[PDB]
Write a protein that binds this ligand. Structure first.
Ligand SMILES: Nc1ncnc2c1ncn2[C@@H]1O[C@@H]2COP(=O)(O)O[C@H]3[C@@H](O)[C@H](n4cnc5c(N)ncnc54)O[C@@H]3COP(=O)(O)O[C@H]2[C@H]1O
Lengths: 178, 182
């Protein structure tokens, strides 16, 4: 199942690596940028999961209420022969009525671009309904791996959504949760 | 289709991205390192494909004759929200009883690590015969995807091999040299 591969790829090749040392890179960010990620809703990685598989590379474009602030300190790992493979995250202010109402670390789940792609292939196949079906399983499979590792919930939130819808707002919702 | 998602991932999420900008970075690497990557066989990205899916992080350990030299310039891309996501590649000397035999860009196919642990997982399951079958399919799917990308053959070389369990001899560093020597 493609989705299980995508989900295991995301965990193994990324989360499992990135998640143990997030709070470390955040204590550093606060010392460096004047205690910006102070709040509890600020000390997690918010991962956007459009079930439509539509994933823009620039967030400010898509919702002008999401403004780039800085990047977390870089994290450098030897990976499968690549020396110092770089793992980098970005920090964002979210706006409400043009005011900075909250800050967080934010990105999309990259492999949904891959799912989209497979789906448009003239021989691979899928349809919108098959692709949406695989997107949900991707998400479901990712959740259930994350359970066996309670370093997840402290460190990361999944934000899942389908568009049959305010992005900067739904992000504030979760930030304000904590 | 697990291997299929993985073959599409390595391309859509990597080779699509970095193969085009590869030669610009090499020529820069040459100007900062005394024209090291001189040969046509050196100006390629060599990707190791162990069908055994045992993919260690450090090469020199797995074959003493593969020595880390330096790194290519990094390429930064805004990607799915991450600003300046970094794409980095490493350069290697390949030794032959202490004599520098060839020099290239070299790495493993990272997703092989994913099949490995997937197989080991208690519930995700599948055996060593099933993982081997999926690793093969990965390569095959990858290679057919790449047909529509004529730049690729001038930029990267897939090096597929299974390691011996029968006692036979296999030299990885030799294998890389053969490919370079093409
Ligand atoms: N440094 C990072 N920063 C932020 N997110 C990250 C990340 N590394 C990984 N991810 C997430 O991990 C997914 C799979 O990572 P993976 O490393 O196993 O497997 C990767 C890897 O095999 C190859 N690859 C991708 N990016 C690479 C890179 N920057 N350097 C070397 N190889 C890379 O592409 C495969 C799939 O790439 P893909 O990007 O689509 O998808 C990545 C991405 O979704």
């Amino acid at each position: 199942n493609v989705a299980h591969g995508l989900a295991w790829s995301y965990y193994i090749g990324y989360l499992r690596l990135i998640l143990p040392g997030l709070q470390a890179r955040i204590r550093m960010f606060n010392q460096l940028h004047n205690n910006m990620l102070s709040g509890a809703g600020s000390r997690r990685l918010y991962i956007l999961f459009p079930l439509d598989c539509g994933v823009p590379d620039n967030l400010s474009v898509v919702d002008p209420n999401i403004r780039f602030r800085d990047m977390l300190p870089q994290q450098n790992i030897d990976r499968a022969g690549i020396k110092n493979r770089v793992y980098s995250n970005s920090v964002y202010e979210i706006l409400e009525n043009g005011q900075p109402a909250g800050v967080c670390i934010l990105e999309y789940a990259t492999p949904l671009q891959t799912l989209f792609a497979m789906s448009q292939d003239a021989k691979a196949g899928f349809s919108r309904e098959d692709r949406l079906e695989q997107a949900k399983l991707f998400c479901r499979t990712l959740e259930e791996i994350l359970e066996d590792v309670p370093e997840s919930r402290n460190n990361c939130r999944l934000i899942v959504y389908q568009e049959p819808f305010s992005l900067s707002q739904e992000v504030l919702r979760h930030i304000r949760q904590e």
